[PDB]
Structures are given as structure tokens and as C-alpha cells.
UniProtKB/TrEMBL annotation, chain A:
Name of the coding gene: caaD2
Phylogenetic lineage: Bacteria, Pseudomonadati, Pseudomonadota, Gammaproteobacteria, Pseudomonadales
Catalysed reactions listed for this entry: (2Z,4E)-2-hydroxyhexa-2,4-dienedioate = (3E)-2-oxohex-3-enedioate
Function: Catalyzes the ketonization of 2-hydroxymuconate stereoselectively to yield 2-oxo-3-hexenedioate.
Isomerase in keyword set: yes
Keyword Isomerase on entry: yes
Main EC class the enzyme belongs to: isomerase
Oligomer status and interactors: Homohexamer.
Keywords assigned: Isomerase
Residues covered by the 4-oxalocrotonate tautomerase-like domain: 1-55
Superkingdom to which the source organism belongs: Bacteria
Organism: Pseudomonas pavonaceae
The name this protein goes by in its record: 2-hydroxymuconate tautomerase
E.C. no: 5.3.2.6
From TrEMBL, chains B, E:
Domain of life, source organism: Bacteria
Gene Ontology MF annotations: isomerase activity
Subunit structure of this chain's protein: Homohexamer.
Name of the protein in its database record: 2-hydroxymuconate tautomerase
EC nos: 5.3.2.6
Keywords noted in UniProt: Isomerase
Automatic annotation (TrEMBL), chain F:
Name the record gives this protein: 2-hydroxymuconate tautomerase
Catalytic reactions on record: (2Z,4E)-2-hydroxyhexa-2,4-dienedioate = (3E)-2-oxohex-3-enedioate
Superkingdom of the source species: Bacteria
Record Pfam families: Tautomerase
Entries under InterPro entries matching the protein: 4-OT-like_dom, Tautomerase/MIF_sf
General function of this protein: Catalyzes the ketonization of 2-hydroxymuconate stereoselectively to yield 2-oxo-3-hexenedioate.
Assembly mode: Homohexamer.
Name of encoding gene: caaD2
Domain (4-oxalocrotonate tautomerase-like) ranges: 1-55
Signal peptide start and end residues: none
Alphabetical UniProt keywords: Isomerase
Length: 57, 62, 64, 58, 62, 61
């Protein structure tokens, strides 16, 4: 699987790497994919560029 | 936040529900956003549509 | 510009045409690009593939 | 629905906010979706990094 | 690197393998990454799901 | 088709332009698509924001 995560800017480099690690871990545990076939992309956005549930920042 | 997962057809509803629970949890933890603010979409396709370690995948067999 | 829309399978062609007309119009107005320069793709999935407000969706049933 | 819009950089915050509102509105009026379940992401790119209809910028 | 291609249903497995071969080569040339490094997914949809030059596309006929 | 290429930052602008040209060319050659219906987005990311085959700091998870 290829997991893309769109989040607000702000996290440190080490915290982003820990998040990628956790995504790999939960993917492996939930659907059984070998970490070696899990691909992750973290993409960071200004809050003004994101709207969830029709909400404006 | 918005999360997408591209993978082959064939995972069960139970597996998808475990996957979403886990991803929402880790993204919630990292971003401080409540789970209700985290959209997730799974995008499924045939095996031929995926190239992993340089080779096209077979259709998934559970 | 390029636009994508992930939503559940089941919308009609007419609905898809309404959506594209509206989105092309709004993006054209915002970007100063002609409609012809705006690519749009709808990506369809089952209900279980969508988690909204922390809950998976049922398959979409046209009416409803 | 989740609508991702890939556009060139340069829009002000206010124009970006208006675009998101307009996308929500268009979606609601086209397919009936409640604004409360419509998600929108605006992604900004350099022109050099985009090609429409096989066009090479410059 | 991760590559995605959205396009209409209807391409043969042969055409898809030719596509991935070409895309993996060009990405490797540009980035230095080996093919094993270079994930690719094709996302397919019906013709009505694609709008090019202001018009919806017919279904792709091989 | 719409091709999105996610790569690490670092290419020169001219190399980015050649990459897009190349993507258009191999798409046309492989599936027959008119360059006029080929749309390409090059998206550049910090290496730290990407994991291929479960690797972080170059090492699998």
C-alpha cells in the first residue's frame, strides 16, 4: 500500500519520521503488509489550504 | 487532515476498519486533531496497476 | 490546473456533468486559466473505503 | 467527497479561502452533499512543475 | 519516488507494463533511484469520470 | 492521463523540465495518448517526508 498523509505544517523532522514509523506499524498490524511493501508520503500544508467538514480556518 | 491509501482490491471490511482505526489514531496523536477531523479514503485497483520493488503485482488473493 | 474528487460510486452521468461544470468554473475564475486548461478526474470507491467523521460509509444508493 | 485542487502559487489567503468556499458550494449544488462532509485541499505548485495538455512551461 | 497515473479503464496489461517501464526509466535517470525504489500506481476510472479540454471523455475502446 | 511524480527535492529547474518532457514522451510511446491529453505534476518533497519499502534513515522498519 501507498499511504499519503496530508497534515498542517509545524512538526519537527524527528516527529514526522516517528509518524511515518507509526503509519508503517499500524498498516502492518491491521492488514498484514510486510514493512518492505509499505510506502508512505507525508505532505505538509498551510492551514488556510485545508478544509475539513466544510470549515474555513 | 486527509489520508489516502492506494492498494489492491481484496481486503475485508474488518481489515479496512482496523486500518482506519490505526491510521486515525496515529495521525490524531501527531497532529493533535480529533479523529472526527481526519478524512480517510482507500483507493483500490487491480494487481497490474501496482508496481512494487520494480514488478507489477498479481491480483490479491486473501 | 488539475482537480480530483474522491467520492463513492453511484452518481449519475448528469450529476458528474454538473459537478465538473461548477468546479471548472470556480477554478477558472480563481486561477485566471481557461476551462480548457483545467483537468478533472473523479475517483470512485465503495462506501467502506470512505471514513468521514470517524465512521465508514455504506455504499451510496441513488435515492436514498 | 474530497476535492483536491492543484494550482499555481500566488493566490492570497483570502482568495484561497474564497476558492474553498466556492468548491464546497459547487459540490453541494451539483451532487447534494452536506457542506459538513465536504473536504477540500488546495495544493500550490511552481509553474515549472506543471504541464497541462503536454505543454512545457516557457 | 512515488508515481501515480489516473486514466480511463481499458488499457491492456501489455500497455501498462510498457508504461511503467518508461516511467521508472525516466524517474531513475532524473533522480538516480533504482527501479526497486520507484513505486507506481495506475488509478482507473470510467470515461465519464475524466474531463479534458472542458469535455467528459467517452469510454476508452482498445 | 494525469501523472503525478513524487520525488525528493534537488533537481535543477532545467532537469525538472526535461523530466516532464520525458514523462510525456514515454506515456505517448507506451499507451498512445496524444500529448494534448497528457497532464503532469512534479511534486518535490524532503527526503524525510518519504518512506519507500518501509525505510526510514535508509533502514527498514
Amino acid at each position: 500500500p501507498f499511504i499519503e498523509c496530508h497534515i498542517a505544517t509545524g512538526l519537527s523532522v524527528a516527529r514526522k519520521q516517528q509518524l511515518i514509523r507509526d503509519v508503517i506499524d499500524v498498516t502492518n498490524k491491521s492488514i498484514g503488509s510486510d514493512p518492505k511493501i509499505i510506502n508512505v508520503l507525508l505532505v505538509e500544508h498551510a492551514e488556510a489550504n485545508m478544509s475539513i467538514s466544510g470549515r474555513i480556518h | 487532515p486527509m489520508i489516502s491509501c492506494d492498494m489492491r482490491y481484496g481486503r475485508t471490511d474488518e481489515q479496512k476498519r482496523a486500518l482506519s482505526a490505526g491510521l486515525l489514531r496515529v495521525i490524531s496523536e501527531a497532529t493533535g486533531e480529533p479523529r472526527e477531523n481526519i478524512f480517510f479514503v482507500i483507493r483500490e485497483g487491480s494487481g497490474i496497476n501496482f508496481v512494487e520493488h520494480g514488478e507489477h503485482l498479481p491480483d490479491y488473493v486473501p
